[PDB]
Amino acid sequence: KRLFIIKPSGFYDRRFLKLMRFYILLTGIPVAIGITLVNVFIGEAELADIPEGYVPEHWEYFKHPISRWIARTFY
Amino acid sequence: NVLQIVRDHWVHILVPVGFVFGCYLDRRSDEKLTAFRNKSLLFKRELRPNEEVTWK
Amino acid sequence: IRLQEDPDPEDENLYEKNPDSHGYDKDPIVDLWNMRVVFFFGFSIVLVLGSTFVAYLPDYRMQEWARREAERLVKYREANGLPLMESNCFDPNKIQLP
Amino acid sequence: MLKIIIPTTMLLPMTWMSKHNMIWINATVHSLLISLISLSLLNQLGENSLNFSLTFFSDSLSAPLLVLTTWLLPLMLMASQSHLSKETTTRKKLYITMLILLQLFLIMTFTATELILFYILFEATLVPTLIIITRWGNQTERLNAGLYFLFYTLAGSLPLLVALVYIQNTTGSLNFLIIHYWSHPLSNSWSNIFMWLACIMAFMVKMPLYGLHLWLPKAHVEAPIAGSMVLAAVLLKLGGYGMMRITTILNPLTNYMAYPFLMLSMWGMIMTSSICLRQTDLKSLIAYSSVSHMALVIVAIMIQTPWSFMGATALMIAHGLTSSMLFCLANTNYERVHSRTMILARGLQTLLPLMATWWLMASLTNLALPPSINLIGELFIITASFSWSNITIILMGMNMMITALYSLYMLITTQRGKYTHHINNIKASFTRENALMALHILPLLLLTLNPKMILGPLY
Amino acid sequence: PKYKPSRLATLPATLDPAEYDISPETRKAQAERLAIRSRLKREYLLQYNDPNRLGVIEDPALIRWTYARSANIYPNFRPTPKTSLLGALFGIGPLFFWYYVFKTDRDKKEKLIQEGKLDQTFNISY
Amino acid sequence: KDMFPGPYPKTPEERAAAAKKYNMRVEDYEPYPDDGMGYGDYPKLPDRSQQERDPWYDWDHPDLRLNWGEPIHWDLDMYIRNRVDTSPTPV
Amino acid sequence: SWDKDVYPEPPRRTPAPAPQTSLPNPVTYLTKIFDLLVDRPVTLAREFIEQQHAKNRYYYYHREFRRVPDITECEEKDILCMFEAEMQWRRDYKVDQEIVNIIQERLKACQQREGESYRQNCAKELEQFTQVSKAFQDRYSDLGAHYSARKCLAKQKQRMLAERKAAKE
Amino acid sequence: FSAPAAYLTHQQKVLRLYKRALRHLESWCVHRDKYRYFACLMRARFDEHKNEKDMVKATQLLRQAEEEFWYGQHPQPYIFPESPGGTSYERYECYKVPEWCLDDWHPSEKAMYPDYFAKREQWKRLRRESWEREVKQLQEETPPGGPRTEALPPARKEGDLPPLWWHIVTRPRERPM
Amino acid sequence: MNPFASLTLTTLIILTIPIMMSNSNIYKTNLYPNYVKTTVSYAFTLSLVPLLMFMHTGQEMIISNWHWMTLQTVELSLSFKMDYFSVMFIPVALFVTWSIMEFSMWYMHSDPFINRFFKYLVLFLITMMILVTANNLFQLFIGWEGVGIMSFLLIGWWHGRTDANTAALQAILYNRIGDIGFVLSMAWFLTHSNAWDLQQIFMLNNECPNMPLIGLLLAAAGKSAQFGLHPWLPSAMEGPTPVSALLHSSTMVVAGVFLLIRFYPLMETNKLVQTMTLCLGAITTLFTALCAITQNDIKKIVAFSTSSQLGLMMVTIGINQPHLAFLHICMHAFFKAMLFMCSGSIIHSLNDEQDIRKMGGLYKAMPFTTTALIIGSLALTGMPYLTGFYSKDLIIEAVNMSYTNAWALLMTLIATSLTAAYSTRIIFFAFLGKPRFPPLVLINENNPLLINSIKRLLIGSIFAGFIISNNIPPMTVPNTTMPLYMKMTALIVTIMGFMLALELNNTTYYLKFKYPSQTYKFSNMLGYYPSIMHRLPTYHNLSMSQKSASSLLDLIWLETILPKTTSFIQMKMSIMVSNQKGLIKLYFLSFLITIMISMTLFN
Amino acid sequence: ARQWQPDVEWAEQF
């Protein structure tokens, strides 16, 4: 005979976990997709010598394109 | 109404305007500290053509 | 000893008026919007974008630069016979010892 | 640096001119935005500090603390929404403004370039704290607690003011950069000894040294949740930051003057962990745990080795987060059972399952479980002290053992056993409390992936 | 043989002479204890089986225990010679002991460093 | 205010009032020796762990093995079932 | 990619496969299965990604700092010279830390590679690490958490005074 | 369980010792045939002096047995699994959720068990109505100076339930799962 | 060589997939335990390949993939040491875990939180793999503490049961007492070799002074439940039988022995540490076996058997035979996990009955578990050409033919005799004789999961010994020549133990009920050790914490010395100054006195 | 539950 199982309310904890996962993913998935697209397509930089008579920009001393964008936009 | 929205939530613009004003003030403060702009033995280099300042 | 209100009953469960509460305030609409604001600006922005910003932060600590300089210096020392790392942080020829 | 100061100030008119249904929402939104903006301060240079202007600067020590404060303000708002729900609108706005003023003062302490401005703001932090503790506290002991805290801090700090002014008169400047470059050794004269004390005791009171720690339990127990959060997360690290900043001009007298404080802290860690083993109040247990954890930071600062400073910074950040989360959990339990007795409510692992997981993770972080930043800091300090003296390892290991013991004892007593029969008001945990715990935990776990950020300027 | 009790291993009820006292005074004492216990239990069950209660059954005993452990210590404290001497030997005793130990260790280390008789070949992290 | 622990009882009237306060009997009520340690009027219950108490009795708090309103030992936390046990041993 | 002079690797002496039994070596079949099911798709994906990277080819440079007068050639209160010298000294400190790191990497690689004969076959690496460690400990040690170029200068002056005293005895 | 008494009579204490002696004898004499042999010998000893009438001597008979029992007590006596000191003691205590936790369920959760919750509300109605009788009934039967035993009165008349019944009746089962 | 790294890293990475998927909908269904079991089986199948490569050539590597942080001259990186020990222990651990997980899918079927149980099992497996495949001391400590915490969480599985909480806290306490020594070793290695990687530590330290090795010894004693820190393992039987079968039988409890094995090139140089390990191992073997002989709880007997085998491994370490100790670990996992699974089957069949006194006549009532238990006991007692023969017999032979502490050797031999003895006990009082369990017999074992798991462990406890011994490269000089009597010592002692124990078991039948001897009380009460060492130190510490610190210093003297005294002085001065008199006749006289005094002093 | 909020007994101290 199937007997009713007395449990504490699990609706609220489950709802909180679902909301937390959804709000994390809402930007995690776009960020992960953007990172993958940037790495695959744009790629990193190559360690070339400083051309004579040329003064590189500050962001031109970093390898990863996202780090270069951060250094060029916010610093 | 649109006017109702602004007249009820105009406060949601202070702190962003505050951040903009703070960034402007930081730039203004940086302006008054250009005593050694290009005169440091380490980063002192000849200005490239069409470059009056290195902004340092 | 005094004419005072009886102690208010222990805080009424917000689930009573609205079973979906999210805590916060008493109005269901403001509860929903406060929960949305908290979750969004806490997890989706300042947590996710914050960790990504701090993960791809440009190397201003000059760790890769230091490693490259160390590689160049080691090449010079070993190729030319120099004993790698000297034993004086400053040249003795510029020290006027008593 | 005004990019963070100006929005913090603008928070006040925003909350004052906001509808009664939107104070909390707007406050949370824009405090979180301010924290997001302040995250940009973590891009510290390898050698030189970020000198924004003549008044404000930030290095790899100031930036983590600034981020911690800007991140903790929204958490304090979320934790204080609950009990401050039946209060009138004006008093809610007043409480929010007190929190904002505290955050602003903390930011300007952590960014100040002048020692006297740092002192002014770090003593200005008392007023919002004291008001919060004595006005919105629940018990009748909040009045004595506020006095103890205020008078301990002032009796510690006034000689610091005298010493700072004397140093300004003698050396000509109190700027951190100048006082660091134009540094000179202190002789073993009595005058230098008392100047060293005046400079040290002020911060020894702030991060509670064993013996001067009596104000911390009262302050953390009688204050509201948000007040305890700041007092545990930032107001204790103020002393550590000040000591790490001022120890530059206190050498080489420290080598010989640190022995009393080193012994006091290395014994008080054991004493306070043992006290935690036999506590009946949850908040008091957490406060004594905070004392025991800050004893390690005191030791690390008083040893003055690079590994000690890195461990001190890591432990400061980690302990702030862990203590804030523990106080929040205790606050939830209190708001449920309206009592702080640890043995009152039992078997909460069967009624609130997710809150039990939050308790478990918080306790694991508290007992320095690898690879958490708590363990990173503790292990760095332990290695530094072992290099200082091999005998230190005995006390360090005993302290670690007792910390694990009392943390797991708290976990077992609260979130385990048979549920309290008569208690019937334990409702399902709200989304707000769970979100608060998640926002306390997730940055803490993420920092283990990039520990370099909170390892201080000596990394 | 016989069982010697201690503080960590109390005397079992069976081997306790007081368990066998049938004198009317002891019986009356037991009756009074049972009466007090039953009155307390009745009050607790009345508060516990009440369908109109939606809170915590406050226990005066627990409140008194908490108060006596924390808030009633100092007001009932008198600085007797026993208390003063115990406080001294437990507060400054271990501090001075550890200071002596650590100071001696540091002095030994410094002496060995000074005379150059201590090896530090790969001690480049401290 | 009169249901809180107070100073060490001196007169027999105070010893009866304290015994009534702690829900004990005047003959059974024994305060700690007034040596200045700050125990006050709190009773010195028998120094026995919470494991010796009858496991088959229907206690108000089963895990703690205590009854509502019953006076609580000073060292209850030390004497819980998860800690130091004073129950008799065979040897 | 890395300069083999900085990170020396001994020439690879791999014994030739000389089976004596006729049983089918399962290792060879497993390696072939792995190379068919993992290596080939991974190599194709890397080829695609490298083509995409080569499509957009940009460069990054190694910033070079010119030498600056040291703390020795620095007036008592010349804050500008002191700042320049302190920054240069901190950069040199970081470079020396990385040099020690490279030597330690060499030592660890030698210890693992040589197998059970590491003790005899890594004496040269141990000697190099000992030299570098002694130099680093002489230069950057016991300075404290508040180290500065002035403090290294003071330690060097003390060491030179000790050397003079030893030489005059 | 059942309400205890202020004391245990000499008859009760002798029986209590007898059960302990046989259970410890079972622990010692592992073999079933071996235990049965010494069980009768134990029974004989408890019947050798059963008819002894001197309560002073009878108490002295008890005392000697307890001392003999304690010395001969098995250091590791057998304990039933679901018994105090047993391996399965309090094993399912973490699953015994009190019934009042169901009132906090979300309506969607309650919508999945309509028949159970509907029957549950009828139980709540019964408790709400009968409570006034139970309060009244207890006052009547209770001696003026409160009660002196934990025994509770039954339902004297019809349309009444035993006072203080709810928790005893709605207690969680031994295997809630 | 190229596939090696990929396979070795995947064998660890795949184990994390169930943890990641625990956030998905699989965790909410009844398929999660089966998914976990299949994941572990696939992990074992993948781990077989690196073992084959190592057997073929000897491929050993170190994969320092992620650079975590560089602390000036110290670089901490995520590095895995794929060597003989790791590459061989991973498959054995995964195989045992697979068997245990199937046995738990059968045994823990009724549990409402079986998904949590399986998730915790995989978490423990991940932590153990981190511990084994660790190249830095920090990563090894991560695995150490992870294993300890998972043990804590699995001992107190039933949160309501207070005894489980006590056992978990006790285990944590002892493991942290060992972690004290572990942290001491880490600090010493960092401050005297400027590295936490095993590579540089082995390189620089060719003398390895006592202190770091003593810290390692303390950590090993803590995790391997050696003497002084032994009682947590027997009390760790408070958790579910799968937990005690997986963690505290085969994988977790050997962590200390594996730590000592990992630092073997360092312990070889030292001599005091070797002697201390040997003495500790002998003490553990003798004491734990002596306690096991008179235990009535089958799980307790098996736990004490695990303790004795760990002591034997520690002895093998003390004889400078690390590879023999590793081989003994591998074989002991195989047969002891099966023994624990058989015990769990017995317990489940007899409705949660664990006392052997109420179990009997199970020889023909449970033939498969009877066969498995018999084979496991024979392997444990070093029956020739079984799994235990290739380890225990070689250990005894090596100990005999070596410069050894004589009493340690004597204790090891006596311990082998007592292992044979307690093996007889778990057969005579459990399978032989007439049934003693209550009526309403529910004995049933025709479950595919239980039978298959026990069968796989049977195959492993019969043939893996031969396979591994013939497949591993020789790493120790064999004891070719040895006096015959010494060559047979192991078998002779085992036979003597078998005969003596069975003789006493027969005498139990004799209707000659006696009273307990002092030695029997000493053995049954575990040497009284978890009765005075669990009451006196704890009481002293707690009473000190309550009185000497909490009241005396904090709430009394500290306050009396500074806050209370000052405030009282200020109050008295306030009362003095504000005399509340207000009479001109008084303070005008005071003015006159002040004028006179000022004129006298300041002139 | 509520804040202590001084009563007459406390107020008459001042």
Whole-angstrom Cα distance, residue I335 to residue I419?
14
Whole-angstrom Cα distance, residue G94 to residue D157?
37
Whole-angstrom Cα distance, residue D328 to residue D74?
13
For residue G104, the one-letter residue type is: Q
Q: At what angle do helices I2-13 and I32-56 cross, to 10 degrees?
A: 160
Residue pair I48/I91 in contact (Cβ under 8 Å)? The answer is yes
Closest CA relative to residue H164, chosen from H144, H125, H136: H136
Q: How far is residue G27 from each of residues D453, G62, I467, I534, I550, measured CA to CA in Å? A: 45, 45, 17, 54, 66
Residue pair D240/D316 in contact (Cβ under 8 Å)? The answer is yes
Give chain G positions within 8 Å (CB) of E124. 100, 133, 136-137, 140-141
Whole-angstrom Cα distance, residue I538 to residue I534?
6
Q: How many CB atoms lie within 10 A of CB D338?
A: 16
| φ, ψ at I508 (rounded to 5°) | -55, -40
Give chain A positions within 8 Å (CB) of H98. 6
**Three-state secondary structure string covering D87-150:** CCHHHHHHHHHHHHHHHHHHHHHHHECEHHHHHHHHHHCHHHHHHHHHHCCCCCCHHHHHHHHH
Residue pair H78/I355 in contact (Cβ under 8 Å)? The answer is yes
Give chain E positions within 8 Å (CB) of F88. 3, 5, 9-12
Closest CA relative to residue D166, chosen from D121, D125, D115: D115
I104: left (phi over 0), alpha (psi -120 to 50) or beta: alpha
Element (H, E) at I78: strand I74-82
Q: Please work out, in degrees rounded to the nearest 5, the angle formed at the alpha carbon of residue I307 by the alpha carbons of I301 and I313.
A: 140
Closest CA relative to residue I455, chosen from I342, I351, I361: I342
Residue pair G108/I199 in contact (Cβ under 8 Å)? The answer is yes
Whole-angstrom Cα distance, residue G99 to residue G91?
12
D contact residues 11-50, partner G, Cβ 8 Å cutoff: 46-48
G27 CB-contact burial (10 Å; exposed 0-12 / middle 13-18 / buried 19+): middle
Closest CA relative to residue D322, chosen from D422, D237, D383: D237
Give chain J positions within 8 Å (CB) of D137. 3
Name the one residue in this structure whose structure tokens are 């462990």: I457
What tokens were used for F81?
């079932």
Residue pair I117/I157 in contact (Cβ under 8 Å)? The answer is yes
Whole-angstrom Cα distance, residue I373 to residue I342?
6
Contacts of D251 (CB under 8 A, 6+ apart): D183, D185, D186, D304, G144, G146
Element (H, E) at I79: strand I74-82
Chains H+F touching (3+ CB pairs under 8 Å): yes
To the nearest whole Å, the CA of H39 is away from the closest chain D CA by: 39
Strand partners, I79: I64
Cβ of E120 within 8 Å of Cβ of G137? The answer is yes
Going by the DSSP 8-state scheme, the letter that residue I583 receives in this structure is -
Residue pair D282/D224 in contact (Cβ under 8 Å)? The answer is no
Question: In this structure, which long-range contacts are made by residues E89-94, counting pairs with CB atoms below 8 Å and at least 24 apart in sequence?
Answer: E90/I548, E90/I549, E90/I552, E90/I553, E91/I552, E91/I553, E91/I557, E91/I558, E94/D267
Q: How far is residue F35 from each of residues F46, I115, I543, measured CA to CA in Å? A: 19, 57, 17
To the nearest whole Å, the CA of H149 is away from the closest chain A CA by: 34
For residue G9, the one-letter residue type is: E
Residue pair G100/G136 in contact (Cβ under 8 Å)? The answer is yes
Dihedral sign computed on CA atoms, order G157, G162, G165, G166: negative
Residue pair D65/D316 in contact (Cβ under 8 Å)? The answer is yes
Closest CA relative to residue D362, chosen from D447, D438, D252: D438
Whole-angstrom Cα distance, residue I161 to residue D418?
8
**Three-state secondary structure string covering C32-45:** HHHHHHHHHHHHHH
Would you list the domain boundaries of chain B? 1-56
| DSSP alpha helix (H) spans, I401-535 | 406-428, 448-471, 484-509, 518-524, 529-532
Whole-angstrom Cα distance, residue F24 to residue E61?
11
Whole-angstrom Cα distance, residue I445 to residue I365?
10
Whole-angstrom Cα distance, residue D311 to residue D315?
6
For residue I5, the one-letter residue type is: A
Whole-angstrom Cα distance, residue E63 to residue F4?
8
Give chain I positions within 8 Å (CB) of G38. 3, 6
Strand partners, D341: D281
Cβ of J4 within 8 Å of Cβ of D136? The answer is no
Whole-angstrom Cα distance, residue I155 to residue I162?
11
* CA I50 remoteness from chain centre: 27
Give chain D positions within 8 Å (CB) of C41. 28-29, 32-33
Q: How many CB atoms lie within 10 A of CB H46?
A: 16
Closest CA relative to residue D260, chosen from D316, D189, D204: D204
Could you give the 3-state DSSP secondary structure of residue I74?
Answer: strand
* CA I310 remoteness from chain centre: 9
Neighbours of chain B (3+ CB pairs under 8 A): D, G
Half-sphere exposure of B45 (CA within 13 A, CB side): 16
| Residue H116 near chain A (CB below 8 Å) | yes
Nearest to C42 among D42, D439, D452 (CB): D439
Name the one residue in this structure whose structure tokens are 């909020």: J5
Dihedral sign computed on CA atoms, order I514, I517, I523, I528: positive
Q: How many CB atoms lie within 10 A of CB I1?
A: 10
Resolution, in Å, please?
2.9
Chain C, chain G: beta-carbon pairs less than 8 Å apart: 92
Q: Please work out, in degrees rounded to the nearest 5, the angle formed at the alpha carbon of residue E46 by the alpha carbons of E40 and E51.
A: 155
Cis peptide before I112 (omega within 30 of 0): no
To the nearest whole Å, the CA of E100 is away from the closest chain G CA by: 24
**Which chain G residue has the Cα nearest residue I72?**
G97
| Residue E55 near chain C (CB below 8 Å) | yes
To the nearest whole Å, the CA of D60 is away from the closest chain B CA by: 20
What tokens were used for G23?
């049983």
What tokens were used for H101?
């936790």
Closest CA relative to residue I93, chosen from I188, I15, I1: I15
Longest dimension (CA), chain C: 96
Q: How far is residue D164 from each of residues D120, D255, I275, I421, measured CA to CA in Å? A: 11, 21, 60, 77
* CA H108 remoteness from chain centre: 39
Sort strands A46-47 and G59-60 into parallel, antiparallel or unpaired: parallel
Closest CA relative to residue I534, chosen from I160, I122, I231: I231
Cβ of B9 within 8 Å of Cβ of D33? The answer is no
| Residue D412 near chain C (CB below 8 Å) | no
Neighbours of chain J (3+ CB pairs under 8 A): C, D
Dihedral sign computed on CA atoms, order I133, I136, I140, I146: negative
Whole-angstrom Cα distance, residue D423 to residue D345?
8
| Residue D393 near chain I (CB below 8 Å) | yes
What tokens were used for D402?
């007792």
Q: Please work out, in degrees rounded to the nearest 5, the angle formed at the alpha carbon of residue G67 by the alpha carbons of G66 and G68.
A: 115
| Residue J12 near chain C (CB below 8 Å) | no
* CA I159 remoteness from chain centre: 21
**Which chain C residue has the Cα nearest residue J9?**
C1
To the nearest whole Å, the CA of D94 is away from the closest chain A CA by: 31
Sort strands D57-58 and G59-60 into parallel, antiparallel or unpaired: unpaired
Could you give the 3-state DSSP secondary structure of residue D188?
Answer: coil
| Residue F37 near chain E (CB below 8 Å) | yes
Could you give the 3-state DSSP secondary structure of residue D158?
Answer: helix
Residue pair D441/D362 in contact (Cβ under 8 Å)? The answer is yes
| Residue I550 near chain D (CB below 8 Å) | yes
Neighbours of chain H (3+ CB pairs under 8 A): A, C, D, E, F, I
| Residue D147 near chain C (CB below 8 Å) | no
Cis peptide before D252 (omega within 30 of 0): yes
Q: If interface means Cβ-Cβ distance under 8 Å, which residues of chain C face chain E?
A: 9-10
**Which chain D residue has the Cα nearest residue I561?**
D211
Strand partners, D56: D112
Residues belonging to chain G: 169
Element (H, E) at G70: none
Going by the DSSP 8-state scheme, the letter that residue D58 receives in this structure is E
Strand partners, I77: I67
Cβ of C8 within 8 Å of Cβ of J9? The answer is no
Cβ of D22 within 8 Å of Cβ of B29? The answer is no
| Residue J14 near chain D (CB below 8 Å) | no
Most I CBs within 10 Å: which of F78, F80, F86, F87, as the mutation test of the I interface? F78
Closest CA relative to residue D270, chosen from I187, I221, E102, I548: I548
Contacts of D450 (CB under 8 A, 6+ apart): C54, C55
Residue pair I268/I320 in contact (Cβ under 8 Å)? The answer is yes
Nearest to G98 among C70, C84, C86 (CB): C70
Strand partners, I62: I81
Whole-angstrom Cα distance, residue I382 to residue I393?
6
Chain C, chain D: beta-carbon pairs less than 8 Å apart: 103
Nearest to C94 among G72, G91, G98 (CB): G72
Whole-angstrom Cα distance, residue C21 to residue C31?
6
I contact residues 74-93, partner G, Cβ 8 Å cutoff: 75
Whole-angstrom Cα distance, residue I426 to residue I498?
12
Element (H, E) at D50: strand D50-51
Beta strands in chain C (DSSP E): none
Residue pair I137/I212 in contact (Cβ under 8 Å)? The answer is no
Q: How many CB atoms lie within 10 A of CB G148?
A: 20
Whole-angstrom Cα distance, residue I376 to residue I379?
5
Name the one residue in this structure whose structure tokens are 């309103």: F69
To the nearest whole Å, the CA of D64 is away from the closest chain I CA by: 17
Whole-angstrom Cα distance, residue C92 to residue G160?
9
Closest CA relative to residue I105, chosen from I448, I354, I372, I460: I448
| DSSP alpha helix (H) spans, A1-75 | 11-37, 65-74
Q: How far is residue E102 from each of residues D300, E105, G151, I286, I573, measured CA to CA in Å? A: 16, 5, 27, 40, 43
Element (H, E) at F19: helix F12-21
Give chain F positions within 8 Å (CB) of H91. none
Cβ of D450 within 8 Å of Cβ of C26? The answer is no
Cβ of G137 within 8 Å of Cβ of E126? The answer is no
Q: If interface means Cβ-Cβ distance under 8 Å, which residues of chain H face chain C?
A: 104, 106-107
Cβ of H75 within 8 Å of Cβ of F58? The answer is no
| Residue J2 near chain C (CB below 8 Å) | yes
To the nearest whole Å, the CA of A15 is away from the closest chain H CA by: 11
Residue pair I371/I288 in contact (Cβ under 8 Å)? The answer is no
D contact residues 338-377, partner C, Cβ 8 Å cutoff: 338
Closest CA relative to residue I217, chosen from I259, I265, I172: I259
Could you give the 3-state DSSP secondary structure of residue E1?
Answer: coil
Whole-angstrom Cα distance, residue I2 to residue D401?
44
Q: How far is residue B26 from each of residues B31, D1, D53, D57, G50, measured CA to CA in Å? A: 9, 7, 8, 12, 43
Whole-angstrom Cα distance, residue D399 to residue I138?
20
